[PDB]
Short mmCIF file of C-alpha atoms and ligand atoms in Angstrom, two decimals:
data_model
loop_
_atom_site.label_atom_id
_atom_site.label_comp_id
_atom_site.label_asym_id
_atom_site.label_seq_id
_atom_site.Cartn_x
_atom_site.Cartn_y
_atom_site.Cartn_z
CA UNK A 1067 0.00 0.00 0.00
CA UNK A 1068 1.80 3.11 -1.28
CA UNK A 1069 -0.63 5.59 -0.19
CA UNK A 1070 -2.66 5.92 3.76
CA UNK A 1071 -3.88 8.36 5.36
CA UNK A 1072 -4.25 8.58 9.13
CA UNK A 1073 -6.90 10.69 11.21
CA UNK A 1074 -6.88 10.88 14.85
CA UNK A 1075 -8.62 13.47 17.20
CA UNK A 1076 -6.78 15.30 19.69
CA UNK A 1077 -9.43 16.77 21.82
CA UNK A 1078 -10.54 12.88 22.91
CA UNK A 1079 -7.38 11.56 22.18
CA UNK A 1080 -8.63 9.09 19.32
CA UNK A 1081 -9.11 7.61 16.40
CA UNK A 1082 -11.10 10.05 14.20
CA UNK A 1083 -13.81 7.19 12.55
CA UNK A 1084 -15.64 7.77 9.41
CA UNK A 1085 -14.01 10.83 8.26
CA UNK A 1086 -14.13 11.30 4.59
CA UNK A 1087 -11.60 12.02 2.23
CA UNK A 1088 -10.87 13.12 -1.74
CA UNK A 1089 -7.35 12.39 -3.29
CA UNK A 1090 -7.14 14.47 -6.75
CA UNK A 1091 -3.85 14.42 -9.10
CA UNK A 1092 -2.55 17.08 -11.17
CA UNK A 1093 -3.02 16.60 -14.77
CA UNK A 1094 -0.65 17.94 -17.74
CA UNK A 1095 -3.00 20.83 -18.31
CA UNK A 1096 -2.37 21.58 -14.72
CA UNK A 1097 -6.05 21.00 -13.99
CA UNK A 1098 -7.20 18.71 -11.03
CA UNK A 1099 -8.58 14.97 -11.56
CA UNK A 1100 -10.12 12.56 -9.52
CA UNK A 1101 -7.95 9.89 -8.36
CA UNK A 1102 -9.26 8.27 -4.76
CA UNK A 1103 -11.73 8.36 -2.32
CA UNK A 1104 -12.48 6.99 0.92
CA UNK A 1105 -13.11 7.08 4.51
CA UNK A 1106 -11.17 6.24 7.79
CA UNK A 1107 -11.80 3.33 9.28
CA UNK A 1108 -12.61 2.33 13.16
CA UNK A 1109 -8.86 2.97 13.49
CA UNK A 1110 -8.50 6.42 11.65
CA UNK A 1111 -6.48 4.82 9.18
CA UNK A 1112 -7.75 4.50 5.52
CA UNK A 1113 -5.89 1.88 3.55
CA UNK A 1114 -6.30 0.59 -0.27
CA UNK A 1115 -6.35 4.13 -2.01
CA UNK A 1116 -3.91 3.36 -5.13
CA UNK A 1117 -1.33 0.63 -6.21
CA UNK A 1118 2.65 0.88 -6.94
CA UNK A 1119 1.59 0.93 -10.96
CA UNK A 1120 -0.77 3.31 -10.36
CA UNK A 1121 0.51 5.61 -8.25
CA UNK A 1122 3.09 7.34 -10.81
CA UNK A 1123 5.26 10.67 -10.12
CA UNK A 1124 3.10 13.76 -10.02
CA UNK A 1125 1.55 16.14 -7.65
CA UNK A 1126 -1.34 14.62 -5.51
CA UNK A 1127 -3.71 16.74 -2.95
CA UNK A 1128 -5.15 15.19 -0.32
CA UNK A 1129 -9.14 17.28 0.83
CA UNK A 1130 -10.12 16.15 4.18
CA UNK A 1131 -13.05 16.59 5.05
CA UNK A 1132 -12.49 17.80 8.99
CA UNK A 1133 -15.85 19.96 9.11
CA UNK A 1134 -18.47 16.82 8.90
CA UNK A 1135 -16.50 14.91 11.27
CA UNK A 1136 -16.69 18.19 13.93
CA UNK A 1137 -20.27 18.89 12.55
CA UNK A 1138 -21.55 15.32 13.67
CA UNK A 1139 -20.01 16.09 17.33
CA UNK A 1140 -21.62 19.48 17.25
CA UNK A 1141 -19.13 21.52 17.11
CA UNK A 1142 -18.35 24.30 14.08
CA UNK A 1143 -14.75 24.56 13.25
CA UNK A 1144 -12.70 27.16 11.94
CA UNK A 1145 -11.68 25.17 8.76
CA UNK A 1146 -13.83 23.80 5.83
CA UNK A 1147 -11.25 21.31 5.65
CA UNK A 1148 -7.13 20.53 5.53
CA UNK A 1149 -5.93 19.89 2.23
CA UNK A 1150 -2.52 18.43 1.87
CA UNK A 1151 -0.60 18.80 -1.49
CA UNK A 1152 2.65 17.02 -2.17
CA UNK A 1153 4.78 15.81 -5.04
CA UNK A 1154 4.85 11.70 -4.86
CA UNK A 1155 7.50 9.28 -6.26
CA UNK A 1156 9.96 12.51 -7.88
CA UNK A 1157 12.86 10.23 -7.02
CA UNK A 1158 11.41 6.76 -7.59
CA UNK A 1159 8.82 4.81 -5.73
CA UNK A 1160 7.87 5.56 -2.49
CA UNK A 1161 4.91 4.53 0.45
CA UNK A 1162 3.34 7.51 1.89
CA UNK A 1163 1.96 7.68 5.11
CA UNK A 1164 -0.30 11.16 5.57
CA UNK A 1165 -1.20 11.36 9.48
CA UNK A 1166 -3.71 14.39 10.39
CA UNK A 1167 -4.41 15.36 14.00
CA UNK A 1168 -7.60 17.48 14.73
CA UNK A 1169 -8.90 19.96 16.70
CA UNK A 1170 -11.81 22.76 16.41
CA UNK A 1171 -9.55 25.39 15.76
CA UNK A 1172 -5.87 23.51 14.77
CA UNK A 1173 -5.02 20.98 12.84
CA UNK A 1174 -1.07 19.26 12.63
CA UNK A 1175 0.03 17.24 9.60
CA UNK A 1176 2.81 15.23 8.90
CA UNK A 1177 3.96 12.89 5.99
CA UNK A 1178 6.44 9.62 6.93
CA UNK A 1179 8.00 8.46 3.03
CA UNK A 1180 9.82 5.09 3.16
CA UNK A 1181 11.42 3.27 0.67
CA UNK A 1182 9.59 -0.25 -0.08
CA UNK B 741 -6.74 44.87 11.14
CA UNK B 742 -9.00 41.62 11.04
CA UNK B 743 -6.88 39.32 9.02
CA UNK B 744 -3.32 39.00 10.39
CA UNK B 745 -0.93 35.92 9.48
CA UNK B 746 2.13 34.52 11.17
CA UNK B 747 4.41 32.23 10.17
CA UNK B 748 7.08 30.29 12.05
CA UNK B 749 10.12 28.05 11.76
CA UNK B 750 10.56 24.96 13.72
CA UNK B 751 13.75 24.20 12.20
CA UNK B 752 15.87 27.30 12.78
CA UNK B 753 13.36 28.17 16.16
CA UNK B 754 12.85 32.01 14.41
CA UNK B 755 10.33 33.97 12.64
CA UNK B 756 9.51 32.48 8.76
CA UNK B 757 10.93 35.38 6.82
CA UNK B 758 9.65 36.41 3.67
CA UNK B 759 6.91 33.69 2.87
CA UNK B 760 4.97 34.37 -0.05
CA UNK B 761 1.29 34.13 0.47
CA UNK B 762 -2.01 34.82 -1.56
CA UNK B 763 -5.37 35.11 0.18
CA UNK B 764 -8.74 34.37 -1.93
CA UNK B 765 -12.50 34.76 -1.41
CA UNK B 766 -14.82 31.77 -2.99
CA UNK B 767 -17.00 33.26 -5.49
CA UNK B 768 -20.42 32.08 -6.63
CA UNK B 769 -19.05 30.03 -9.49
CA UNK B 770 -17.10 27.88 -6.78
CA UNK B 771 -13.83 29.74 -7.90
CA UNK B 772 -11.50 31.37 -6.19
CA UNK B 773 -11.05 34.75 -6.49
CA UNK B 774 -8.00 36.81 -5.51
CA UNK B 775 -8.28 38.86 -2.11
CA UNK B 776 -4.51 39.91 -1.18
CA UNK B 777 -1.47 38.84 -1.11
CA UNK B 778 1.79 40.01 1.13
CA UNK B 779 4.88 37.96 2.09
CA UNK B 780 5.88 37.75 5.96
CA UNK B 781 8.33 40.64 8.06
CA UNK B 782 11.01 39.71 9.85
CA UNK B 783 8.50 39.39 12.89
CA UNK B 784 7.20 36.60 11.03
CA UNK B 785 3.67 38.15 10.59
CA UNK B 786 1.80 39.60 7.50
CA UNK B 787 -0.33 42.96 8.16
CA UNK B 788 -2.81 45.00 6.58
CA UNK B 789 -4.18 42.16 4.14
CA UNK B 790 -7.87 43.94 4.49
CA UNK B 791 -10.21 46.36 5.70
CA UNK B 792 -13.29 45.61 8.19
CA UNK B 793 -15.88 47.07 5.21
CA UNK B 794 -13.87 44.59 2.70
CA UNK B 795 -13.61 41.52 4.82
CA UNK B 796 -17.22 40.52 4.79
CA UNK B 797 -18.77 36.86 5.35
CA UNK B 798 -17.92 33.98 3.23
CA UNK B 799 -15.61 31.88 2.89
CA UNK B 800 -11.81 32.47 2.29
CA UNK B 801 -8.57 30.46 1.47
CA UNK B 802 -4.27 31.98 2.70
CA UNK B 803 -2.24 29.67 0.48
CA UNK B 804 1.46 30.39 2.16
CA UNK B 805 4.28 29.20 -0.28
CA UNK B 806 6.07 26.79 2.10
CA UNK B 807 8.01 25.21 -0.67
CA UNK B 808 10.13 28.50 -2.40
CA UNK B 809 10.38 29.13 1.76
CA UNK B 810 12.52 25.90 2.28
CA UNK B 811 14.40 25.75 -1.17
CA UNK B 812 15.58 28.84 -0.76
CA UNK B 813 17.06 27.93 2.84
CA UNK B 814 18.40 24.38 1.12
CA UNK B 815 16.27 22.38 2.66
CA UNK B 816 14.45 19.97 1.10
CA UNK B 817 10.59 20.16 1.61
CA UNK B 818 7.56 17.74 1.64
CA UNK B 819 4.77 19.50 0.91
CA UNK B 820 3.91 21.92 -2.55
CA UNK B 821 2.39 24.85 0.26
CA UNK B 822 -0.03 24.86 3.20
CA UNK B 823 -3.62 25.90 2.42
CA UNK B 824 -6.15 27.13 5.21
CA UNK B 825 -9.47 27.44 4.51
CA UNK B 826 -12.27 28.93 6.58
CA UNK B 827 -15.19 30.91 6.60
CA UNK B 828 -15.04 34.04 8.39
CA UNK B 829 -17.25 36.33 10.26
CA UNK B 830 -20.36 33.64 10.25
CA UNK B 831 -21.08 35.39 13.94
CA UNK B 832 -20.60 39.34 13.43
CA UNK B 833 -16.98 40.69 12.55
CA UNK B 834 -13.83 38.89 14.69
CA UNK B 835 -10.22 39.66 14.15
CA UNK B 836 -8.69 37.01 12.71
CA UNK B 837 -4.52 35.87 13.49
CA UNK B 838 -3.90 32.21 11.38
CA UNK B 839 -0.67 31.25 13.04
CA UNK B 840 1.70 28.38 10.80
CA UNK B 841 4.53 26.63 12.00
CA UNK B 842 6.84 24.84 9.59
CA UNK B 843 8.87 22.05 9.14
CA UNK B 844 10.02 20.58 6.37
CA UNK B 845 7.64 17.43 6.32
CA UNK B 846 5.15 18.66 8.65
CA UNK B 847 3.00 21.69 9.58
CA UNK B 848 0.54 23.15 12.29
CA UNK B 849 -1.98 25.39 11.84
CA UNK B 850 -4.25 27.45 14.29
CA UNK B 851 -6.75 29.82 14.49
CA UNK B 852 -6.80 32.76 17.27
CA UNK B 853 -10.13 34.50 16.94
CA UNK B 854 -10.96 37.36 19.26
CA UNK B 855 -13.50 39.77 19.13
CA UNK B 856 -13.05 43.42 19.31
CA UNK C 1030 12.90 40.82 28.41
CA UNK C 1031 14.67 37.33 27.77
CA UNK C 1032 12.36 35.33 28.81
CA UNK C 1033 8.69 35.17 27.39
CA UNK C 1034 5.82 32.39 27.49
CA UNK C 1035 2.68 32.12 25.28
CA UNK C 1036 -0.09 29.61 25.49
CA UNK C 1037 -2.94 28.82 22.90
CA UNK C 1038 -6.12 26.89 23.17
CA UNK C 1039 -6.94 24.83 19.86
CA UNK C 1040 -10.59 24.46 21.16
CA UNK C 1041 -11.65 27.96 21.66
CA UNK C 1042 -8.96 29.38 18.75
CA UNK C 1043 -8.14 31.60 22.13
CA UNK C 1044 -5.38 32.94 24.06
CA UNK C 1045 -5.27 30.26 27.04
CA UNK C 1046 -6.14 32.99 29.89
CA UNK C 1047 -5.18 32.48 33.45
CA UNK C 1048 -2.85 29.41 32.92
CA UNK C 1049 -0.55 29.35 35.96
CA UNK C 1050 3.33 28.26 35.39
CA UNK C 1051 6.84 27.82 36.98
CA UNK C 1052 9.83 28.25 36.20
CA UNK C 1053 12.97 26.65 37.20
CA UNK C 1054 16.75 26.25 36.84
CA UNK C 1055 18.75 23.64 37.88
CA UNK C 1056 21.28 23.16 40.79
CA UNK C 1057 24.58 22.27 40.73
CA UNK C 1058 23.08 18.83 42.20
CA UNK C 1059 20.60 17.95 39.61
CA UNK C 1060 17.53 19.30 41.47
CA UNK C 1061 15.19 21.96 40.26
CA UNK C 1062 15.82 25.07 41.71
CA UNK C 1063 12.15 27.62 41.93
CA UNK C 1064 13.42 30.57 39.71
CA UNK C 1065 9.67 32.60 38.33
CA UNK C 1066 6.20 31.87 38.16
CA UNK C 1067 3.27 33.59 36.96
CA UNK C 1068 -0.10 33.56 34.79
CA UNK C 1069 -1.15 34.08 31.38
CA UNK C 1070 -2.59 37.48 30.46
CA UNK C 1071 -5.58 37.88 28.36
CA UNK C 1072 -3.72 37.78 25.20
CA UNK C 1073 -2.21 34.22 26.56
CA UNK C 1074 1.45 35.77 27.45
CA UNK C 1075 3.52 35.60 30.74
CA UNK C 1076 6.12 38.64 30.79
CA UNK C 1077 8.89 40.18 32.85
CA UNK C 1078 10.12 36.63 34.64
CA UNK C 1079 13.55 37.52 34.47
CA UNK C 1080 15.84 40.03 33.50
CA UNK C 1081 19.02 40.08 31.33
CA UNK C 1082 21.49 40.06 34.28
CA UNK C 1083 19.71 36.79 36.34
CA UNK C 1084 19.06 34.87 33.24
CA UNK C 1085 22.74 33.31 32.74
CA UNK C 1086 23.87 30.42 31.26
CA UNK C 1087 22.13 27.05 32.50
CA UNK C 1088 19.44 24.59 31.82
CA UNK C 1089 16.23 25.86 32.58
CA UNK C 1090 12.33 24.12 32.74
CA UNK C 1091 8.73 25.39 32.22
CA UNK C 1092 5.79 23.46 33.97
CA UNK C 1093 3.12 25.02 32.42
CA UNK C 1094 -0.52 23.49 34.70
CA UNK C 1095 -2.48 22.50 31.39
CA UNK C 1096 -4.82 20.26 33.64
CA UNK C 1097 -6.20 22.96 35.88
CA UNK C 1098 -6.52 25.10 32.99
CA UNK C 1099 -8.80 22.21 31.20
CA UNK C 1100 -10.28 21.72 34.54
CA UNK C 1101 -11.86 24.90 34.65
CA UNK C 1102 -13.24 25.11 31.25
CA UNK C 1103 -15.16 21.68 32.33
CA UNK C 1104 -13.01 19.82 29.66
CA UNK C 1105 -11.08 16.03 30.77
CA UNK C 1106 -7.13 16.55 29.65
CA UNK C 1107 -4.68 13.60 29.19
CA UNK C 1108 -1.66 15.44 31.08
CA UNK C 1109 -0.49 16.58 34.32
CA UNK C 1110 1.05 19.55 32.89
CA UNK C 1111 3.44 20.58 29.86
CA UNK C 1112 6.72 21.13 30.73
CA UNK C 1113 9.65 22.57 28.85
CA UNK C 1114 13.03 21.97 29.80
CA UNK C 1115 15.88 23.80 27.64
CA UNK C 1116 19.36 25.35 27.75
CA UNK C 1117 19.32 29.01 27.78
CA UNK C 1118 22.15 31.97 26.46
CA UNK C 1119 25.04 28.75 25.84
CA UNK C 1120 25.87 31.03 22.47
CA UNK C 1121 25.08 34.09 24.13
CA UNK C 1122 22.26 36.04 25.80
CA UNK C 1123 18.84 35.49 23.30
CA UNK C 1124 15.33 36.15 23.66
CA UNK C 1125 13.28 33.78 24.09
CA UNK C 1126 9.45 33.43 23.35
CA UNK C 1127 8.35 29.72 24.60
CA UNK C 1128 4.76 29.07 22.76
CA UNK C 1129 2.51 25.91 23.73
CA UNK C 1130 -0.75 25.60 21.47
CA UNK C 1131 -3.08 23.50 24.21
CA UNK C 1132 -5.74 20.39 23.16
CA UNK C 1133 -7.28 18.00 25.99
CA UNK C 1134 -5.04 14.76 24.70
CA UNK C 1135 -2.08 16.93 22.73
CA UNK C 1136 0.27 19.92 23.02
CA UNK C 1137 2.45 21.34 20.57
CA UNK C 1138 5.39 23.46 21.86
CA UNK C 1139 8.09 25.94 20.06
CA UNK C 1140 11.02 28.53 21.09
CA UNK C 1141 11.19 31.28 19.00
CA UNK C 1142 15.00 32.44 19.74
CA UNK C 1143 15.96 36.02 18.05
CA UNK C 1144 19.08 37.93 18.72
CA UNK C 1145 19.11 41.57 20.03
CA UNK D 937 0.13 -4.19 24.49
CA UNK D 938 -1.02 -1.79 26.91
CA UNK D 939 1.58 1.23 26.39
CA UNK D 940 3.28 1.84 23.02
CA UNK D 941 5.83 5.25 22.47
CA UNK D 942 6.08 6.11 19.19
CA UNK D 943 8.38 8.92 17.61
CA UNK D 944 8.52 10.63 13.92
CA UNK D 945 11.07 12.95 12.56
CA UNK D 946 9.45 15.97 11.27
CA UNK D 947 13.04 17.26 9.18
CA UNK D 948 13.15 13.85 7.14
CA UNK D 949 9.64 12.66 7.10
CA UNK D 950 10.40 9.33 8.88
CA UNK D 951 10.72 7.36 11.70
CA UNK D 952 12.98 8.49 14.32
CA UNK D 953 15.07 5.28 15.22
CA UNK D 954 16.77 4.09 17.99
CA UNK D 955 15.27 7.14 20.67
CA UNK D 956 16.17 6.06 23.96
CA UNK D 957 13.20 6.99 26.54
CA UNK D 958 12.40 5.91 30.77
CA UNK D 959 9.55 6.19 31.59
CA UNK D 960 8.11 6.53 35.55
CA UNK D 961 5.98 6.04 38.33
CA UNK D 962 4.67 8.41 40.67
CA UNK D 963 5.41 6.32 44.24
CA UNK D 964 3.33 7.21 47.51
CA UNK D 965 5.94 9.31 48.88
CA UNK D 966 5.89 11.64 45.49
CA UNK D 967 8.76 10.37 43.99
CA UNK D 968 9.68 9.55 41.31
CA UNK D 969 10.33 5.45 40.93
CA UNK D 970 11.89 3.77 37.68
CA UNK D 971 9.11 1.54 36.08
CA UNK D 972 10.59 0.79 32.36
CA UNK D 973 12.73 2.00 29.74
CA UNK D 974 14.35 1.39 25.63
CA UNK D 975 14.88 2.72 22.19
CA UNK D 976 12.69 3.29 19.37
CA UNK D 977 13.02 0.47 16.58
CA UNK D 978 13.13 1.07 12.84
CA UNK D 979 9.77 1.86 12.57
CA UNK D 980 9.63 4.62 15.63
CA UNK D 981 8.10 2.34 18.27
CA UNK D 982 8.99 1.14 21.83
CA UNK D 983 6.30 -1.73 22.75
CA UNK D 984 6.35 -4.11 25.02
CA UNK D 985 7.01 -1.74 28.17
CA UNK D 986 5.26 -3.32 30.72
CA UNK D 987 1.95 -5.80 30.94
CA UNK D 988 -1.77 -5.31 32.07
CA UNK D 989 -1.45 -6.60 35.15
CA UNK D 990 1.71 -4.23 36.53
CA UNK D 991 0.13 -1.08 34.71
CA UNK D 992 -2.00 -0.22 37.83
CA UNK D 993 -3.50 3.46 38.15
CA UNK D 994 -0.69 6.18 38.76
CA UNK D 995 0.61 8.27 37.24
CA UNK D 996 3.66 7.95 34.88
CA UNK D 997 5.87 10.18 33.13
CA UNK D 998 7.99 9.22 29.60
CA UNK D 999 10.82 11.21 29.65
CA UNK D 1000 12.62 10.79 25.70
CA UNK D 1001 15.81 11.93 24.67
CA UNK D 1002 15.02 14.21 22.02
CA UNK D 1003 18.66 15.58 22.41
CA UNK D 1004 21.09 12.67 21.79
CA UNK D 1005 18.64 12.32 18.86
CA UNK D 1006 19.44 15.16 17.19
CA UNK D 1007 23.24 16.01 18.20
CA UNK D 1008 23.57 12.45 16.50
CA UNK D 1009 22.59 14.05 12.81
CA UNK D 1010 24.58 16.69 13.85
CA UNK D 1011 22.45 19.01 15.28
CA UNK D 1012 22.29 21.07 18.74
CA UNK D 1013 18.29 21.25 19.50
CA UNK D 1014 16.51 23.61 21.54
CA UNK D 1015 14.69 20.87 24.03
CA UNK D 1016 16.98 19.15 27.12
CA UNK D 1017 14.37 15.94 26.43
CA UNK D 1018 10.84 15.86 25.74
CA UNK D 1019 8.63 14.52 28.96
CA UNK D 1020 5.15 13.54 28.70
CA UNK D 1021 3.16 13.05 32.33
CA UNK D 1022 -0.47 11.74 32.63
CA UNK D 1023 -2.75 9.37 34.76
CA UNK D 1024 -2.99 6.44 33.92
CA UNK D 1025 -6.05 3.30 34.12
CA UNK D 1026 -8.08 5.38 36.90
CA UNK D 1027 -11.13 4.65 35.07
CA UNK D 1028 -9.79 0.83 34.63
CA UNK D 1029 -7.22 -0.75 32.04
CA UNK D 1030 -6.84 1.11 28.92
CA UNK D 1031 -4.31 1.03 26.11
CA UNK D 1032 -1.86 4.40 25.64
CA UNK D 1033 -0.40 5.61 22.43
CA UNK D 1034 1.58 7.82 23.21
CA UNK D 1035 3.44 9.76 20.15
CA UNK D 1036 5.91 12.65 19.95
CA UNK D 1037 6.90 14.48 16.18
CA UNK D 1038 9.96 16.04 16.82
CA UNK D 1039 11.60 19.19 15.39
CA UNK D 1040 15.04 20.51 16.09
CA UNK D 1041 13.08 23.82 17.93
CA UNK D 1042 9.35 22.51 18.39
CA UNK D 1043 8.00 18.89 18.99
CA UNK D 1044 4.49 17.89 19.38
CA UNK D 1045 2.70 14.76 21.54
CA UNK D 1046 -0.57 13.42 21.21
CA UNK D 1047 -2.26 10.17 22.72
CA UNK D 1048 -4.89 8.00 21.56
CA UNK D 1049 -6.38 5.72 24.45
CA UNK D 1050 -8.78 3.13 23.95
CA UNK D 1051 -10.61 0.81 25.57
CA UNK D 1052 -9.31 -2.98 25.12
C1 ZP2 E 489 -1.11 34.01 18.19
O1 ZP2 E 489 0.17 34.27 17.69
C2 ZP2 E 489 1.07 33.21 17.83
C3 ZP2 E 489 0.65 31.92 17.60
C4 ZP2 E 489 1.52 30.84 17.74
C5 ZP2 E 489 0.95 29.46 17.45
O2 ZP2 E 489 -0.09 29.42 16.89
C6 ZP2 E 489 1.58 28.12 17.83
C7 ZP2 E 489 1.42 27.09 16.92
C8 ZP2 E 489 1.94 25.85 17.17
O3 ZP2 E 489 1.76 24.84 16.22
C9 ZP2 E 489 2.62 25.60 18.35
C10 ZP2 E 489 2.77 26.62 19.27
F1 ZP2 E 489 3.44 26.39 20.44
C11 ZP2 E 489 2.24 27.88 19.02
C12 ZP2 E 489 2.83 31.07 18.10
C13 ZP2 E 489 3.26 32.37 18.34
N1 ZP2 E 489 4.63 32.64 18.72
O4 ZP2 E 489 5.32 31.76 19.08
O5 ZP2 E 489 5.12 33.95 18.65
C14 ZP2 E 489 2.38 33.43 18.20
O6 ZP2 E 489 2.83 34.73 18.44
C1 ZP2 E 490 2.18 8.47 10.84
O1 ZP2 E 490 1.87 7.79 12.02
C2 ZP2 E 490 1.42 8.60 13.07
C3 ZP2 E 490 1.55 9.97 13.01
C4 ZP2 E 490 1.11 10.77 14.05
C5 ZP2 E 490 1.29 12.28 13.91
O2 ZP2 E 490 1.25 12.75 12.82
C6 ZP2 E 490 1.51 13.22 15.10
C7 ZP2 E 490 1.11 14.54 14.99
C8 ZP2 E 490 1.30 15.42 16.05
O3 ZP2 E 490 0.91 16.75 15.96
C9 ZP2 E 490 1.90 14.96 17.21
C10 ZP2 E 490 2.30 13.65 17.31
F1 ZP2 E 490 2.88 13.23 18.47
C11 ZP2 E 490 2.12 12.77 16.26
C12 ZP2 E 490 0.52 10.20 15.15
C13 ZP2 E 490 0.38 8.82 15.22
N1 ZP2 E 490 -0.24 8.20 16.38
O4 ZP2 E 490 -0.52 8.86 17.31
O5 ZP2 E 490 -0.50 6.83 16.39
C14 ZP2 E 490 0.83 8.02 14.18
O6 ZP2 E 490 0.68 6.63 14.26
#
């Protein structure tokens, strides 16, 4: 798995379950396409995204969608979401790990690249 | 001023000099339309971005240019820039201060919201 | 003033107001020597805990009382209390601003060091 | 597995590996008594600390040594060690997560608890 994403809550100090999520990629005329979707599991993690072959260099973003998951537990946040944009596999393959920690008014995030 | 930005480096443990950024209001169309733009002092922080007539409700996007902030220090960086996006002023006018602190494969961000 | 402290509360997007800390320095035989102490203003800062002449050379440590501060807004934290523990002026006298952005389970802390 | 430390590098995007931490128990006389201790393996993770049955209610404090971490790459930090100090099981057994994203000026913990 060469792309996860991880979502944990920092004002319970969990997982944060069910939280949706859009992965685009950058096409040549620099517009963005459609390339994932899911949503985090009972662990905050969501797995399965994309494979090695199709997971090729280019620019990726990452729209996480923080404000339903706050929403449900009544609370309004300051963001509409966190978006997280990064050139992938520049240098050769790589596994991406993209970890998100929330709060109402904050959110932290982090990327840990390996090499498979 | 109700739209102030800071920007810090937890790298070097100092003020993020010079980091570009462009502000945007989401039009009807669901496009962004340019707002302001500034880059940060040598206190870190970006000033005088709006006026309380200008700075009305809706919802508005700071993309700060994280990536030209670490090449040019020689460092390599993860992500392409950090985006924040909120609505502002849902409850009456606030002053806004959207605080960033950088590394180089990680960010924070947070909101400090305080009415006048 | 050298010696500066700053607390944030990523549930609010507020100044934390009224958070009580100590400061300390240690002895010569490893224990932790009372040095300062004070609250955060309304704008979430401690000042004036030193001056230029006391603050010498040494290792120094925060305890900032995050769980009283929690306490009192009705919300359960994770920690005791933040503390940071650094060496101060070993290049030099700095200043020193020592930020702490506050959620129930998670802190973030930073020094922003400048130069006079 | 009822107390995990796990530590990321927020300069390389990565694990930080072989982070030596103690951690400790508050005793009944207040102080401080040695309960376990180790390093961070390739992946960033201590397990295997203690077991359900000797992780009573107390409270315990993780001290990790943020600093031999980074003068290893090279690099003089701004934080002596980064301590993290919380109750523990007074509501019965849970598991603790406890993670810490470290920066050469700024780190970050969070903890996720849940219930076994
Ligand atoms: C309101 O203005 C400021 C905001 C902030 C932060 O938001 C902050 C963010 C973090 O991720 C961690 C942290 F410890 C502080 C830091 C400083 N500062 O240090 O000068 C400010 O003046
Ligand atoms: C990639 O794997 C993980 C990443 C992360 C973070 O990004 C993180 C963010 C912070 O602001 C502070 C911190 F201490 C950790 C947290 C956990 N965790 O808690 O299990 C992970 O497994």
């Amino acid at each position: 798995c060469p792309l996860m994403v991880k979502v944990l809550d920092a004002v319970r100090g969990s997982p944060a379950i069910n939280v949706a999520m859009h992965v685009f990629r950058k096409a040549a005329d620099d517009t963005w396409e459609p390339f994932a979707s899911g949503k985090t599991s009972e662990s905050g993690e969501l797995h399965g995204l994309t494979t090695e072959e199709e997971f090729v260099e280019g620019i990726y973003k990452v729209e996480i969608d923080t404000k339903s998951y706050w929403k449900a537990l009544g609370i309004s946040p300051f963001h509409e979401h966190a978006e997280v944009v990064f050139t992938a596999n520049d240098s050769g393959p790589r596994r991406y790990t993209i970890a998100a920690l929330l709060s109402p008014y904050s959110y932290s995030t982090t990327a840990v690249v390996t090499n498979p």
